[PDB]
UniProtKB/TrEMBL annotation:
<feature type="binding site">
    <location>
        <position position="265"/>
    </location>
    <ligand>
        <name>Ca(2+)</name>
    </ligand>
</feature>
<feature type="binding site">
    <location>
        <position position="276"/>
    </location>
    <ligand>
        <name>Mg(2+)</name>
    </ligand>
</feature>
<keyword id="KW-0106">Calcium</keyword>
<dbReference type="GO" id="GO:0009313">
    <property type="term" value="P:oligosaccharide catabolic process"/>
</dbReference>
<dbReference type="GO" id="GO:0004308">
    <property type="term" value="F:exo-alpha-sialidase activity"/>
</dbReference>
<comment type="similarity">
    <text>Belongs to the glycosyl hydrolase 33 family.</text>
</comment>
<dbReference type="GO" id="GO:0016020">
    <property type="term" value="C:membrane"/>
</dbReference>
<keyword id="KW-0479">Metal-binding</keyword>
<feature type="binding site">
    <location>
        <position position="222"/>
    </location>
    <ligand>
        <name>beta-D-galactose</name>
    </ligand>
</feature>
<feature type="domain" description="Sialidase">
    <location>
        <begin position="113"/>
        <end position="297"/>
    </location>
</feature>
<dbReference type="GO" id="GO:0006689">
    <property type="term" value="P:ganglioside catabolic process"/>
</dbReference>
<feature type="binding site">
    <location>
        <position position="275"/>
    </location>
    <ligand>
        <name>Mg(2+)</name>
    </ligand>
</feature>
<feature type="binding site">
    <location>
        <position position="232"/>
    </location>
    <ligand>
        <name>beta-D-galactose</name>
    </ligand>
</feature>
<feature type="binding site">
    <location>
        <position position="275"/>
    </location>
    <ligand>
        <name>Ca(2+)</name>
    </ligand>
</feature>
<dbReference type="InterPro" id="IPR011040">
    <property type="entry name" value="Sialidase"/>
</dbReference>
<feature type="binding site">
    <location>
        <position position="265"/>
    </location>
    <ligand>
        <name>Mg(2+)</name>
    </ligand>
</feature>
<dbReference type="Pfam" id="PF13088">
    <property type="entry name" value="BNR_2"/>
</dbReference>
Length: 572
């Protein structure tokens, strides 16, 4: 069961430009304003190197330096079409990527002499911000999702292989976010943008779009993209982040997205016409369906941003946008998939993922050994830095096992740090916390081992433990309101679990194990092998649980609790 492996850094932010050339060669093009180039693997995605593009490959007339054009293979002709993320022209290939490239004109002909500035004025220019062209209807139609400023997603449609184009009648829209508590302001408004499109086996098109809601929104088309159903929430959580859909050779559907919940909007968020800060872009997730979208499995973290705890995160190597969001995939073989993900040269990666890992049923961790690669523990310094970023601090730290062992364990407590406070924005991120991903399940058993730290505790000191269906920030105290199951561990007057109104004591200065066995709308809580009580489901979930979330509850600085091991098994 092989773990995801990082194999290279793509030469552009992920989302466009990754393309299989043949059985062993894969290329990732770049958005360079200079002579075109690409990163190439000649061993089916394991090793990579830069290479300059041949003289016939057109430069990037449109687009932007951080993003490559989209290159898609026409399934009938095996030639390629190239479209920029913004501006520029439509190029069709003749003789493959290294052959002859022709530009589409406004009349619908192919222009061979595009190096001439005078001949580029008559070239077709598709408007809006575009994503990946998709060939549908047995390869006879190509559609390109685009979104302008404001109107939502629509589709450029061509039944001529890219020669002539029209626009869909309608598209995908999504509603504005409403400032209601826990929010103190409105999220930046995105009207169903940057859509990904997948053709279903029965001919229906499924569009999945990025919104200002808690999840991507979706719409369906029964006419190959000409008209679309009323938009509705999808099952893929995530705000203001991109989705990507793909299909493996055997028909399995793959979903890639950032399965996160952003911090609630603060008191200075704005009117929704601009973004103040991104707090949900430090991971990427994968889910698969073997039955045409009926049921999904996985929902696993592909990768966590390696710099996510850094106090200079927002400004390391310039201020531009960064993170693990945005993605594109290429199947390597029956069991393995290559994924390009992320933004900014320090964060974007090429990753190989295995199906058998996506379908695994168990996961175990020890905080001292796995903190860096598996645990989300960062809190934010709530001061705007760079472009819509916050610098970070680890909200929890590893300490020596108080029993005298060699283990390091994670101390989770209310911090004393004035940098974690912004009075005007009215946010306080001083509650330490930690969260960990495991394979999705509507039934499961999670066990964790914990201990009360010896020292002074505040009156409300303790831990809120939550099972959630997406990644909540380690310092998000409202997680319990969205959790599938949640309960507090309270340290005062004496340590006890609170299950509804039943108090279940446990001793200080000793390691204890809690297990949660959930099935349908109930979870049975056990303490040291003995049943302690049952929890009713707090929130229905379309998918099931895939995260456990721990956060301190103290309102004053305190010693808190220690967290050692977590073990999860799903699908009983
Ligand atoms: Cl171009
Ligand atoms: Cl700055
Ligand atoms: Mg905002």
């Amino acid at each position: 069961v092989p773990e995801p492996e990082v194999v290279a850094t793509p030469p552009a932010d992920a989302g466009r430009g990754l393309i299989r050339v043949d059985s062993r060669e894969i290329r990732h093009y770049s958005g360079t304003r200079k002579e075109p180039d690409y990163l190439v693997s000649r061993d089916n995605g394991k090793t990579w190197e830069m290479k300059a593009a041949p003289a016939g490959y057109p430069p990037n007339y449109g687009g932007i330096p951080k993003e490559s054009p989209a290159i898609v293979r026409n399934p009938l002709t095996r030639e390629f079409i190239r479209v920029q993320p913004i501006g520029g022209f439509v190029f069709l290939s003749r003789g493959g990527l290294d052959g002859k490239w022709l530009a589409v004109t406004n009349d619908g002909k192919l222009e061979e002499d595009w190096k001439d500035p005078e001949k580029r004025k008559n070239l077709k220019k598709l408007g809006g911000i575009m994503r990946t062209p998709v060939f549908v209807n047995k390869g006879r139609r190509v559609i390109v999702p685009f979104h302008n400023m404001g109107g939502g997603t629509k589709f450029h449609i061509s039944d001529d292989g890219g020669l002539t184009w029209h626009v869909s009648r309608n598209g995908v829209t999504s509603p504005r976010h409403e400032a209601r508590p826990p929010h103190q302001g409105v999220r930046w408004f995105n009207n169903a943008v940057e859509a990904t499109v997948l053709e279903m086996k029965d001919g229906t098109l499924w569009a999945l779009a990025r919104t200002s809601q808690d999840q991507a929104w979706q719409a369906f088309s029964k006419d190959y993209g000409e008209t679309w159903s009323k938009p509705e929430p999808s099952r893929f959580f995530g705000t203001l982040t991109m989705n990507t859909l793909g299909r493996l050779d055997d028909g399995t559907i793959v979903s890639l997205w950032t399965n996160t919940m952003a911090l609630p909007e603060n008191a200075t968020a704005g009117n929704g016409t601009w973004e103040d800060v991104f707090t949900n872009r430090d991971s990427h997730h994968i889910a698969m369906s073997g039955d045409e979208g009926k049921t999904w499995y996985g929902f696993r973290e592909i990768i966590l941003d390696e710099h996510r705890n850094h106090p200079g995160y927002a400004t390391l190597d310039g201020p531009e946008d960064r993170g693990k969001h945005q993605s594109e995939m290429v199947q390597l073989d029956k069991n393995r998939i290559l994924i390009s993900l992320g933004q900014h040269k320090n964060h974007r990666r090429l990753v190989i993922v295995d199906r058998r890992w996506v379908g695994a049923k168990t996961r175990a961790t020890q905080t001292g050994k796995d903190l860096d690669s598996q645990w989300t523990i960062h809190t934010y310094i709530p001061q705007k830095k760079g472009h819509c970023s916050y610098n970070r601090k680890p909200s929890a730290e590893l300490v020596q096992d108080p029993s005298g062992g060699t283990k390091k364990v994670l101390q989770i407590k209310r911090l004393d740090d004035p940098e974690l406070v912004n009075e005007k924005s009215n946010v306080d991120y001083r509650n330490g916390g930690a969260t960990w991903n495991f394979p999705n399940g509507t039934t499961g058993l999670v066990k964790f081992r914990f201990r009360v730290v010896d020292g002074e505790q505040a009156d409300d000191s303790g831990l809120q433990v939550s099972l959630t269906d997406r990644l909540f920030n380690a310092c998000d105290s409202t997680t319990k309101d969205y959790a599938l199951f949640t309960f507090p561990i309270r340290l005062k007057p004496a340590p006890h679990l609170l299950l509804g109104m039943k108090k279940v004591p446990f001793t200080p200065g000793a390691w204890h194990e809690i297990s949660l066995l959930w099935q349908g709308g109930q979870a049975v809580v056990s303490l040291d092998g003995k049943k302690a009580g049952t929890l009713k489901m707090a929130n229905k979930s379309p998918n099931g649980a895939s995260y456990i979330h721990f956060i301190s509850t103290g309102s004053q600085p305190d010693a808190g609790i220690l967290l050692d091991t977590v073990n999860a098994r799903v699908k009983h």
